[model samples]
Target: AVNGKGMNPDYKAYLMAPLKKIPEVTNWETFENDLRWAKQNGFYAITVDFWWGDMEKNGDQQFDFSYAQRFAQSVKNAGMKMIPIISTHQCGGNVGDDCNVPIPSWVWNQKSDDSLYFKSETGTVNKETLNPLASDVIRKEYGELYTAFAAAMKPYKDVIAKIYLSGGPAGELRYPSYTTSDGTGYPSRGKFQAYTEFAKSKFRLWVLNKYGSLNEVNKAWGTKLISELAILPPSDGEQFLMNGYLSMYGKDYLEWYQGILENHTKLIGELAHNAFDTTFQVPIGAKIAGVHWQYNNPTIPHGAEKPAGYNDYSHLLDAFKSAKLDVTFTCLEMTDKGSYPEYSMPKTLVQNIATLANEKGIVLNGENALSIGNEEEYKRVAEMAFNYNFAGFTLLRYQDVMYNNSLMGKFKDLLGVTPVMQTIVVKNVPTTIGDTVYITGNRAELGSWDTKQYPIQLYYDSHSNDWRGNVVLPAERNIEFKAFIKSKDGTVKSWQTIQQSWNPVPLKTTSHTSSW
Candidate 1:
């Protein structure tokens, strides 16, 4: 751990793709070999971040973390820990996109914005922004995402490393940007429409109510009064002579932004504490981490100047402290030859921050380590040990290290000798069917099992190659159950889910393995 936080680094599952193509990786032998290597290498935690798009699979959203389930099991069997980062944006399916970070269209549909809020003339409709706190839809979406992933990974929290809230607090504090007359606009439609609708409908209502209804004045005039309602209010000078418009509308904008953050924090914190199965987070690498928030223009590609009083960090720290949350400070993005600096904070800045975290009783996790170029960068990160004073560390991923031979070598050098390979020997196998099975996987544990489910693959079954997919099993006897198992890739031949028998079964127990 680094500075009262765990030292484990985050491994981005999607980042490994040469061209964003993810081939099936749940082979028993393949996973086993990887686990064997990681254990020997001395990695503290293996991390996984599942994009919302992939899990939702377009309109048909039945949240599934089977792959994660399989992966977590592999880790458990290999005697390693696992970590999963819940994600919002998706790459494919439903509101899918070719570029990165395309949120589903439905995400925007969550709220109605006929209120006064930040808006654009051509793009945004409102004069102001919508309030996330007031929007139940926003809360529901985020809450659903949190609960679903938490439940899926429930089986592996102990053997699994820990859970990080992704770059979420940022996801929650979304603001609507405008469509420049330059013909370019924010990628998503939700932000644009919400802003505009609120500006026109809600703002007009506010104006009319405060200024006194046009109804009385219109009675003396002609029908044109009603038509005039749609016209823009007269304000030609650089500044408006009237204070009413600016104070009311402007105050709404600032308050809306602040409320979005505050409400999102409260809701997310509540859901994680009450419903989620593991430690949560307050992301530390992006805009939401306002203290460290920095944006890079895609066209110019340079670090923008720091804003005055960017106190997003203080707000987040307070939130976490209030909830007593275990946070994942995922400073994962590191620029190399690219436009941005490789590190989120210079080494000294990070050290001081660590010291502060300790003083403040906040847990600072070192996620997304080695997200940049190579293992050397990771070793350099070891310097964080003295600076942060953390308990353990979270490695970005197990699969990446396993696949990259050179990285694996460096991992062994930095962490230690690979862990010994041994099956978890227990007299009582967790064969009860539901509760007892705990799965830890590696390439050898090739058969698929729902990585989203329990950590241990319970009773092995006949099913599709991956144990995680649909598997069918016949329960005949009541056996004492204990979760803890590991297998080889391609070990599961086939399986399917079946309807349970209303009548309870009697007597004996049986077990079998398949060679794919």
Candidate 2:
């Protein structure tokens, strides 16, 4: 563990495709062989997509966990930890051209209201989603489903390390960008959704809270429409300005949409936490799209039209941190190529994400957009995570890595082997009330004395009247580190002097205890 904030020693993770669908699942020999292959490849854990569609496919409100149980056992027997991702949104036809209806046919048919599914601007429902803003009945059912799922997973808590609460399409927190009119083909920005009456009503309430009255809104939005809860903001056309008349309305529209996504993530995370809090103590996380990467284009390609702005990492990170859920970003592949209109290179996007996660005191995980099969590119991506001290990352799938033995061997070589290191446990650092403690040093592991580039905030221990955390350093390497106090608003106060630690030529791990 690095600092008191680190997870289990085995940190690298993989986002496993449906294990039940794998051909090896039908054959014991091949399944075991695959497990052996994974072990040899040095993966820390397998994150299975618990497709809600398949589990409840039998209808009659009947839920099945046989596939889930078997999959969990296979990973457990293979001596690897399991991370089950509960997908709330069905997949079949998604915004990014991927298709799969994970929602059971029965549940799809049971929707009696338009709010049950996200409605498009064309007044059509995107059957792919089980609208997060559905009626109370649907929401309650989801709550119960989570409870049942937690109960089902209770028996396997030992092997389970974390649970990913899916937020939206493709397990990301975003609107359904594609429309039914758009055929099943690759499209960058298909269509934006959730313009249903339900959404409009919510927006009306939000506007009221923000603007107070229709007169106020009219003056701010440059609109003459009468004030009421039914008033809808302009979604298209030049009237939705960025720096002109009624720009606030357009801006609020996008912010409101973003809030829906954040609310979906926070509510689901809370539901899962409540369901499992009593029976299991496991970390819960939500997967967010690489917003910076997707919106890298100056025009911002969302919903086929640019909005005033897109979802900000600050809001999403704040929501996840408030919900006590870890945040994982999708696709580090965007950074592999240093060709972008924005910052110097793709790494700038990653640095921004990592820094935000650090500021919020949340664990950050990431994934490759597509597999980087045995290329030096893969190593470059991995180095970014290690250097920034991210919690870990998940590769897109298992088959991709298995198909390329060289890639498997490459990742194993890159991640599985590290120089033998001594563990440092610093204790009794000074801290003002509500301030977090952190250590900075000259070594690469400690941000090379660059606090802004890579912040390493230590966790506090109240019982010992001390600030303590763990750090790994190379064996026999003398290290110099200094402690500092950080406030909630990102304020830093460095220690007056630097402290030093000397390691023996032969050492596995060690600790340093001192008072500041």
Candidate 3:
């Protein structure tokens, strides 16, 4: 419905949920009205946090989707799209505190397969979360859960916009932060993850494959392990700079931890992609914790918490992009003041994210997971999102906006605004030495899929195997285009496959690079 002042159609707006409290898996009446009202007010889609524990609480093989189906139907009926987010980490609980509800009780109770649980340095298993790399059996079970979920969502795929595959704790890709050192409590700073035997085995393999010999490992870690490649460096709190381990083994330590987390993201993302791609064509994405980009892990105020650099934001983004996700969103909470103390402005982080997204050909989005009503800050975040060429911005829950009319009014105005666009270039379309590339699509300038009409040919860079071209589309318009190669004689090869399909463009005037 038009409110005289047109709505901002460039970025897609979604309402992130849990909606203050977990919605009754079976009951919809209480939230349905609020949902419908929210849709009418401004939200285009509902990003529902689908709990794994809730669905499998009864037992291992037992699963339920009736409630989910009902909820999806309700959302569609209310004239809004659904973005189902699958949480594999933990449910009813969060990062800082345990909400009592862990994963399915059977998942932790079964002693027959101990590999399903994540192991701590002290030999205790993490009951709150499952180790994604536990074993083939565990991976198979996890895949089955996703398969069942995709099947359950099969009917609603039409109304489903995207599937956000949750990565690690609290739905962002990071290691367990609850582990304690002295038995009392951990300081505000968190701890690095992956001391499990499974992690150790994989790290050994990663080193062996990467370097090829014990000699190389010894040289890299500055240690004398003539034949012991299986030995891992001490865990996070083992010994610090005093022991010279941090100076001698710091690089290798972070690399090992970062590599494992990267693998974890790819494994989970691929599982979701395979399951969902089997039934639907919707995009698949994952949420990552905000990177403290202003300062490296060592310089972060929470020094001890970020040891071994397990939370390496830079490398994690690279890994996610390498995983080939369609979109990757940053969970930038309200406490993150886009300006200083944390760099004061969103430039460093937002620009870094945009650069990665552009290079990897993925959509970038942001979310403010805060409950307090702060219109000025929210507006600025939205502004930074637009300025940095993000696909869109998401607000945590409906409950926060429902009671605050002031914030809601600002929200409506922001929704109606579109980001400005500048000319952007596309790069890296493969071509033979003499062949050429051209882009065509639905827009008139794109020749509307008619290669013979107004086609935009890409120029070849003499120094490299990359092709470059520029285009500027109208703001808020959904873009659809494809690239094709032309033989030396001007014979256009058939359009590239779906894998090469440059579907919708981000809501910014930025070009992207990709390999054919």
Candidate 4:
């Protein structure tokens, strides 16, 4: 598949690369064929990343936007929204014409040696030769990068483009020297690199605020107390200070990292503000899509502590707020085969994050939601999202499930506002004055059984229109039971009025909205 090829993502190859056996697109003819396939299959949009190198290969001085223009036009011609991705890091770390999608080399050139170098209290040098964060230079460059993407994107903006701003990729270690030359050492900066820039800047200011000078900071907490540094307990208890010598220095280095990322978000926001007239949405995968997020949320996979006593949701939300960024890429977390069930985190983390996004007025995307095959899982996830107030869902990588199978078909049926109008006549759900009642339905047929990993809470109505105030049945009867709907008009619709029937056979039924 075309990876770093920018405009020409070897579109033909990528179409079937995942399965490793299919070859749906090998040329223009096949691509057109696939495009036709996409339409017949009900695709709302066609996404193609607007790689930086393809648009601005030179030092922000030159740009080649024609290829992407053609791609956008082609998708537009087909009547699909073009989701353009302004992502980072060309695969293979190739910069310039060598790789079509790499971020411009000018970006790295903007930073200073210290700013470029991944840092720690003891020393610097993460996995790479430079750190994108240490310098205001890189942040400023990204501002330009944002403006550039925004500019090149305008031609397609109001028309067919639904642009998605890439806020760096996962585990990229863009900061210089964050990784090792041999690639065998522990995370040199440890957990600090991932925190936020404001934390670092504030930590420095905190030093100043506490001791009144960097000199005092160096003496009191920086160097003089080297042996005693790590021995000191964490002030917040959530602080991650490890590796004795490294942890001592790592803490200070991390403070800087936090500052850099916070600023990075702000820079991105600035560019987004200039580039587009409307707000933008972010995407995430199923697994821990981005380390920037925390596990405290119920929808995402809350795993073992990445940092001691770390509270992920608050930190993630705070990072977004600090950057002044509210919109999130729901699929920000990616789900691979190895990351589900036990190894991966829970979907609730994502659901909770979506709930938070709605509170923040952020949009939830349908990216990772495509991978969810279970109905209860989908309903629990999607219904929760729908019930709450999100901008909507931006489902990611749908060429497979949507086009390949009946998956998207099912999705549409559930998403339909009006239930496929069903009218069935049946007996009432039986119950006496004190007959402990129950209700049962086609659990497998309902969207919930397939959408959620958990089951929905069921209830019986003794009095019509009292669903909310109805008593919660015993847990044992919650799974499946006999019950009926009492119509608001006094016209009763019952499945079967058989009282005390432990396992009453399900009867034909019609479900209608209740009049509160």
Candidate that would win on lDDT: 2
Cα error of candidate 2 at position 115, Å: 0.7
Candidate 1 wrong stretches, greater than 4 Å? 1-28, 58-61, 91-135, 148-158, 167-259, 277-310, 332-349, 368-370, 374-376, 395-400, 412-516
Model 1 lDDT per residue over 1-516, tens place: 221121222222111211131235456556555656666565554555566655654553567677667767776777765555555533322111233534454445544543323443244332122343344654566577677766777767666444444323222234433223312222211122223444345445544554466664344223245553552321221121123224444333333334345555566566556555334333221123212212333321111111111114455456666655554443433322322332123343345445666668776655443343486555444445322543333454445566787886664544332212122222323233333233322111111223332123333334432232111111231112222433333232222222122121122222232221
Prediction 1 TM-score vs. true: 0.50
What TM-score, computed on C-alpha atoms, does each candidate reach?
Answer: 0.50, 0.75, 0.69, 0.57
- Clash pairs, candidate 3, are 8-416, 10-476, 190-305, 338-344, 339-344, 339-345, 340-344
Residue-level lDDT of model 3, residues 486-507, one tens digit each, is 7888778656554333344456
lDDT of 4 by residue, 427-494 (tens): 34343343222233332222222212222222444355233212111111112322344444423344
What is the alpha-carbon lDDT for the whole of candidate 3?
A: 0.59
By summed lDDT, the worst window of 10 consecutive residues in model 3 runs over 1-10
Worst 10 residues of 4 by lDDT: 1-10
Reference-based lDDT, residue 152, model 1: 74
> How much lDDT does each candidate structure score?
0.40, 0.62, 0.59, 0.39
The order by descending TM-score is 2, 3, 4, 1
Candidate closer to the true structure by lDDT (higher is better), 1 or 4:
1
